[PDB]
Design a protein around this ligand. Sequence first.
Ligand SMILES: OC[C@H]1O[C@H](O[C@H]2[C@@H](O)[C@H](O)[C@@H](CO)O[C@@H]2O)[C@@H](O)[C@@H](O)[C@@H]1O
Ligand SMILES: [Ca+2]
Ligand SMILES: [Cl-]
Ligand SMILES: [Cl-]
Ligand SMILES: [Cl-]
Ligand SMILES: [Cl-]
Ligand SMILES: [Cl-]
Length: 251
Amino acid sequence: SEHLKREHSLIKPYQGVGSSSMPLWDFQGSTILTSQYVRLTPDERSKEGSIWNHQPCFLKDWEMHVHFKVHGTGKKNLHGDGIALWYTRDRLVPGPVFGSKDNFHGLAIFLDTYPNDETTERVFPYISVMVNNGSLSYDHSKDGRWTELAGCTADFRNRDHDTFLAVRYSRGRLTVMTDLEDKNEWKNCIDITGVRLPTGYYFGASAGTGDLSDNHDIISMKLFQLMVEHTPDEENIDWTKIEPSVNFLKS
Ligand SMILES: OC[C@H]1O[C@H](O[C@H]2[C@@H](O)[C@H](O)[C@@H](CO)O[C@@H]2O)[C@@H](O)[C@@H](O)[C@@H]1O
Ligand SMILES: [Ca+2]
Ligand SMILES: [Cl-]
Ligand SMILES: [Cl-]
Ligand SMILES: [Cl-]
Ligand SMILES: [Cl-]
Ligand SMILES: [Cl-]
């Protein structure tokens, strides 16, 4: 907690919601609050909700831990659609990508609970990452097949114990880990390198329901600064002007 950045975190009872204090997040769309959780959508159809951090993040090296809960009463496979976690240029704009805008700038981590793709080769729920410069559209009907950078299957729905995600970004390495099995352990999901993201973007979370639904709750988001060396050469460039992109190792 020494490196907890409170201004980039969402922690109960949620600052400024139930008091005269100033809030640290904007609550948008279907989102509602209780003293115990932020609920982005209820288990009802055609909802879109988001939360957006007030201040841009200027940390070069960070790790976000998200305590979330996806749960509902839909029978068999009749539930959806999932949660998106954002580190993006823009904030507050609703849209078709789990409740937030398409053609975004920055990083998305999708926790997709419904296979829209009739010819999918993936097992759901499926957690994936996407990096965008404004040009790409998330093809919702194909579960973002064409724009997936990396991903993993993850059993996070309707669990009897707390479920957590970690997203770590430092020196181009993007790692996503899960804690879904009540083992107090981070299990790898995604670990990739060559990911270029600027400082000055906003953390956000969103969720959407369509003809299928689920409760999509965020209990906390805790952002930690990683103490990572950058040389005077590395430090001098303007990190706010980095264009979101990915460098790829050749075959
Ligand atoms: O029918 C209203 C609903 O339509 C669209 O959602 C569709 C699809 O994208 C969803 O994955 C599934 C499962 O929830 O539902 C629909 O078939 C969207 O336009 C959505 O916003 C809307 O509520
Ligand atoms: Ca889907
Ligand atoms: Cl808060
Ligand atoms: Cl409904
Ligand atoms: Cl569809
Ligand atoms: Cl369980
Ligand atoms: Cl896990």
